[PDB]
Amino acid sequence: NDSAVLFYIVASQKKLSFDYTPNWGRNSYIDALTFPRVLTNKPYKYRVVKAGQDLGVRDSYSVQSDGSQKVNFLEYNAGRGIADTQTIQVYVVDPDNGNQYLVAQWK
Amino acid sequence: NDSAVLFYIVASQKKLSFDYTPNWGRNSYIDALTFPRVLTNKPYKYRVVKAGQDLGVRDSYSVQSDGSQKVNFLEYNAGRGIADTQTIQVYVVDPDNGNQYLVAQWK
Amino acid sequence: NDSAVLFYIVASQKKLSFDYTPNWGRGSPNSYIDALTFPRVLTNKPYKYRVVKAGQDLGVRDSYSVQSDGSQKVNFLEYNAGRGIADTQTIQVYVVDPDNGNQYLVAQWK
Amino acid sequence: NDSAVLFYIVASQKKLSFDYTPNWGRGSPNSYIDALTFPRVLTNKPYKYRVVKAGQDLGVRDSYSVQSDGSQKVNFLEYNAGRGIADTQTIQVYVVDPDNGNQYLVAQWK
């Protein structure tokens, strides 16, 4: 029963809206990923892990006016897109302590 | 640093929008309270505590179409409104285990 | 997967040890539960307990002092008018946060 | 007030005991940190550790077996090419969740 955790957020945030349903971008490559509504309380960076291989952190793109934010894999895979044959994992990085939390995954 | 808790919700909910900024309803009485956007994953009941005195739980009103939900204190104070001289506390009640979590307070 | 919440506690507490394995105490006659004891209880706050007997809220009472072996005992006689609770009813014991009044279920009998 | 998260752990774990008080191990010469030891570590999963030395990610290695007294030791020599880390750099030790790959800071040196 996770509701104590749920309402702890509600207690501390009061009002909060987020969408991390991922919008992956294609031909047999995944070039990027977009989140419709990201959290903005901190300047979060992102880490991409490609089929188990860690591509590191890069600095985030700006958050859009409709609240969306884009993670472009080309800045992470040295200019190449990633083949859908591989699994991809996208972590939010906490700029204060460097913690990272999985927020998206591809097969 | 509460962000691990924050992104645990994000992990498990992906998409989630809530507003518990309270809209208290008045002449020197607080008749009710409204939340603009409540959580709906469970049929949550509400408990009202009046200046330290516990008024118990009652069954919730339906959630509106714009996502709002109203807590009417008259069903809790035996028909009387509550005087603003008193502090009021409104708890969400988890219908599975009966846990309760403070979500609103008046002076 | 809730390891994030777990290690959020670990980072904030660094060192923490608890045991809320319920130890149900029987009265006289045996078919009466008159207490609950926890081997090790969190002590960062003076927590309180609420007992709910077969749907009926017996209310909140201040919690007995913590024992030297870290244990604490909820005495049902304080909540149920000097009688223990028949062991056919379901009993629920909530921990009450003295600061905000939140309550969290920690023990339940049938 | 985060007692809700706390008692969410208590309800799920019932019984739990940990100590991540860092015990920094010095090498030769003394001005080198070559290990970190934790007196009691969570064992519900085979956790892994990542060391970050003065901003440089030394990566993830599998964690030494847990000792009989519940303790576990992160050996920096495994991450830093057989040399210990100069105690003027800041060292960060993250716990890695083997299931999803999340990482949580548990220790930090200056």
Numbering used by the authors:
A (entry chain B), B (entry chain B): 5 to 30, 34 to 114
C (entry chain A), D (entry chain A): 5 to 114
Manuscript text:
Fungal immunomodulatory proteins (FIPs) are a group of low-molecular-weight (MW) proteins investigated as potential anti-tumor drugs. FIP-nha (from Nectria haematococca) contains two glycosylation sites at positions N5 and N39. In this study, the impact of glycosylation on the bioactivity and biochemical characteristics of FIP-nha (from Nectria haematococca) is described. Taken together, these findings indicate that glycosylation of FIP-nha impacts its thermostability and digestion resistance.
